[PDB]
Design a protein around this ligand. Sequence first.
Ligand SMILES: [Cl-]
Ligand SMILES: [Cl-]
Ligand SMILES: [Cl-]
Ligand SMILES: [Cl-]
Ligand SMILES: [Cl-]
Ligand SMILES: [Cl-]
Ligand SMILES: [Cl-]
Ligand SMILES: [Cl-]
Ligand SMILES: [Cl-]
Ligand SMILES: [Cl-]
Ligand SMILES: [Cl-]
Ligand SMILES: [Cl-]
Ligand SMILES: [Cl-]
Ligand SMILES: [Cl-]
Ligand SMILES: [Cl-]
Ligand SMILES: [Cl-]
Ligand SMILES: [Cl-]
Ligand SMILES: [Cl-]
Ligand SMILES: [Cl-]
Ligand SMILES: [Cl-]
Ligand SMILES: [Cl-]
Ligand SMILES: [Cl-]
Ligand SMILES: [Cl-]
Ligand SMILES: [Cl-]
Lengths: 116, 116, 116, 116
Amino acid sequence: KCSLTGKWTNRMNHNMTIGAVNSRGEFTGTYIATVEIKESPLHGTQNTINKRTQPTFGFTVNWKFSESTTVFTGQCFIDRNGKEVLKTMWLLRSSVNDIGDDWKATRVGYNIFTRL
Amino acid sequence: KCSLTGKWTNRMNHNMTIGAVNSRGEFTGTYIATVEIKESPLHGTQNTINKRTQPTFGFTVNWKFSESTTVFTGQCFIDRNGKEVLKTMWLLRSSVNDIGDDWKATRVGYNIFTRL
Amino acid sequence: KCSLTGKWTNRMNHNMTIGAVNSRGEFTGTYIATVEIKESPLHGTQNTINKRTQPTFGFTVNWKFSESTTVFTGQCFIDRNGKEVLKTMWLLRSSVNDIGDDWKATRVGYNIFTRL
Amino acid sequence: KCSLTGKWTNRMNHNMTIGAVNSRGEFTGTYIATVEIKESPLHGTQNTINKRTQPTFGFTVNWKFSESTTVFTGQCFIDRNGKEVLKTMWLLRSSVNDIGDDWKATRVGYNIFTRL
Ligand SMILES: [Cl-]
Ligand SMILES: [Cl-]
Ligand SMILES: [Cl-]
Ligand SMILES: [Cl-]
Ligand SMILES: [Cl-]
Ligand SMILES: [Cl-]
Ligand SMILES: [Cl-]
Ligand SMILES: [Cl-]
Ligand SMILES: [Cl-]
Ligand SMILES: [Cl-]
Ligand SMILES: [Cl-]
Ligand SMILES: [Cl-]
Ligand SMILES: [Cl-]
Ligand SMILES: [Cl-]
Ligand SMILES: [Cl-]
Ligand SMILES: [Cl-]
Ligand SMILES: [Cl-]
Ligand SMILES: [Cl-]
Ligand SMILES: [Cl-]
Ligand SMILES: [Cl-]
Ligand SMILES: [Cl-]
Ligand SMILES: [Cl-]
Ligand SMILES: [Cl-]
Ligand SMILES: [Cl-]
């Protein structure tokens, strides 16, 4: 079984720590990145339907040093070597002033996390 | 201020209800979708940095009838008329059986929500 | 049949003109936007497999006033009212200087085009 | 300069060959993917504004064995070692039968290509 609880790294400038996952799949944690290091809360859920060994999940990082918001979604895999890996994709939402600037406010990307 | 608390629709087949936003910007809600109607829980945060009148936000929908997870991120705007509108984009993560199908598991899209 | 040839608008600040589509599905055109109006070339293809009435397509806009590149992909639908509509999604790629800034270089969004 | 002309791989199941880039930045090529191997044509542009050593680019793959279309956009970098690398993200558009299934037709992902 791949569990989200624990400490993760993207082997770059990001770590996160995710706490216990409750019976409804809910969890909280902390996202730590270099800008100098800043810490920000995250909240999310992992899928509990069919109690899969490799569940999907999502979370929102509510950045404490920015007006922006990021969401991540992905899946907790057991890789061919037996190691847990989170394969994620993210959307980063910038705060714009006018609704006419909305078009340029969303970036996308990806991250791969392994246990730390 | 554009506040997330309340009931929202995308005029299509989707309604959302969001509860009280606490002082850290955290909220919970339900997402209602005609697949016959199914209700699933959502958990999210709105950005409180600088107390903007039009904050960004994100949330995760933990579908009750699927192994999938969806994340939404966007911004709560006041348009010309003074009406609230949530401009969002999302990532829908499918549950794949093997890490080699990971490439095909992520869909992207958008939704515009208004009150009621 | 929904064809890409002709003039399109997003009913906002964008028009495009697409030329004839050849037997391999290839086409060229021009993307016109307000920054003041700028014109830029586009090149793409529409799917010819199974000769669908509502084909998928993609194109690249090679912006003449920017270091950036946009790609669009979507489908040419006949809507319920009989009108042709292009439903698209796009990725906008910014030029960054270091490969370490790669993460913030891609925006995503959408456009809906109807004949002009 | 990082030039697109040549042969590329993502070390997985994909190779690409791209031909000469003309003076407007336009190129054609072939995209080779193990589904058994299938070859499909690609058409694209690299950005020539300011003659950057690391230009952005986009292209469309018109799959020969599918009703789908994929677009790729990214940037041609020189990494620490002086090796060329294409960092890309893509949109894969499925062909749906009705405009009401449009919401589920777009997948997103990424690929990193190196020479050979
Ligand atoms: Cl900010
Ligand atoms: Cl950030
Ligand atoms: Cl592990
Ligand atoms: Cl922005
Ligand atoms: Cl990324
Ligand atoms: Cl990563
Ligand atoms: Cl309300
Ligand atoms: Cl499912
Ligand atoms: Cl199920
Ligand atoms: Cl779903
Ligand atoms: Cl799938
Ligand atoms: Cl909508
Ligand atoms: Cl630029
Ligand atoms: Cl632009
Ligand atoms: Cl029409
Ligand atoms: Cl940027
Ligand atoms: Cl958009
Ligand atoms: Cl539009
Ligand atoms: Cl080569
Ligand atoms: Cl197909
Ligand atoms: Cl086929
Ligand atoms: Cl395909
Ligand atoms: Cl599909
Ligand atoms: Cl790759």
